[PDB]
């Protein structure tokens, strides 16, 4: 493992993509998700988590960061450990 290695690049790409997705409303986030929504194609702003504390102009939160990082690490684990199984 090193900077620029395949595993490092996989995880960095995964976390960047996930955080961008839930920052711009492409993935369910703290301030906007399917809780109390209508259909699969539309998420809604969560009043309970609305203005829960952020200095990012889209309202991106630390819990959003932690959730996206956890999901990205989970996905990176799944993808990297594919091809490491013995068989």
């Amino acid at each position: 493992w090193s900077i620029g290695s395949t595993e490092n690049m996989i995880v960095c790409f995964n976390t960047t993509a996930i955080l961008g997705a839930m920052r711009f409303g492409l993935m369910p986030s703290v301030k906007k998700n399917f809780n109390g929504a209508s259909s699969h194609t539309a998420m809604v702003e969560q009043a309970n988590a609305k203005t829960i504390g952020s200095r990012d102009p889209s309202g991106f939160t630390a819990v959003d960061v932690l959730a996206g990082g956890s999901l990205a690490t989970i996905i990176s684990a799944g993808e990297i450990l594919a091809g490491q199984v013995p068989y």
Partner: protein, 227 residues
């Protein structure tokens, strides 16, 4: 009103964290300091007082981690006395020194000395003015307290320092206590991982940051194991 301090505040946290409490930046992501539903040890006064006691103990602890090691390394104190914190008799398997009495005798001494100090402190916390009333060997006069358990302006403020700007100084101490709690957390953490003392970890990071950091230390998670 700064980055890394808006992370924790919310409707709940800002509902009760007005800001007059010393070093109140609103960072309460959990509902631990909520006045309604308070009780036991999760009431806001206990948390604030415990934060301050932890901060002061952490400042003393970090200073006692750094001072014997630095002063032995330069040569101020004896080398035998300038042990690292975790090898200075805290853990005899890890390391011990031959003090005046037996390390367990010292433990019992310091134990009852801390008992007699901390129980007085507690009774000031619960009954403020009662610590200056009973005749405590003629020492109650300077142990009356101040009504604030956190800040007894009696003996302990004998220099009367930080009086012109007490509010600013109150914030100074909270922030230093927070920094020292994190510092002591770290010192234990990279004493558990690296196996060396905090100053040696520091200088190792100063010389070669890319070879004496966390990610490199994962390969060498014990250094030399004394067990």
């Amino acid at each position: 009103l700064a980055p890394l301090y808006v992370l924790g505040n919310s409707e709940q946290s800002l509902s009760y964290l007005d800001g007059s409490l010393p070093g109140d930046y609103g960072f309460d992501p959990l509902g631990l300091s909520d006045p309604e539903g308070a009780g036991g040890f999760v009431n806001p006064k206990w948390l604030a007082y415990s934060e301050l006691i932890h901060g002061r103990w952490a400042m003393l602890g970090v200073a006692g981690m750094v001072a014997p090691e630095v002063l032995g390394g330069m040569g101020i104190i004896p080398q035998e006395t300038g042990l690292v914190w975790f090898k200075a008799g805290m853990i005899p398997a890890q390391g011990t020194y031959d003090y005046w009495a037996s390390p367990f005798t010292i433990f019992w001494i310091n134990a009852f000395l801390m008992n007699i100090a901390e129980l007085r402190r507690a009774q000031d916390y619960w009954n403020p003015g009662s610590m200056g009333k009973q005749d405590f060997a003629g020492l109650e006069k300077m142990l009356g307290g101040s009504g604030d358990p956190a800040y007894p302006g009696g003996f302990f403020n004998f220099m009367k320092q930080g009086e012109k700007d007490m509010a600013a100084m109150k914030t100074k101490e909270i922030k230093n206590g927070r920094l020292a709690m994190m510092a002591c957390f770290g010192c234990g953490a990279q004493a558990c991982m690296t196996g060396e003392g905090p100053v040696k970890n520091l200088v190792d990071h100063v010389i070669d940051p890319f070879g004496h950091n966390l990610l490199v230390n994962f390969s060498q998670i014990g250094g030399v194991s004394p067990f």
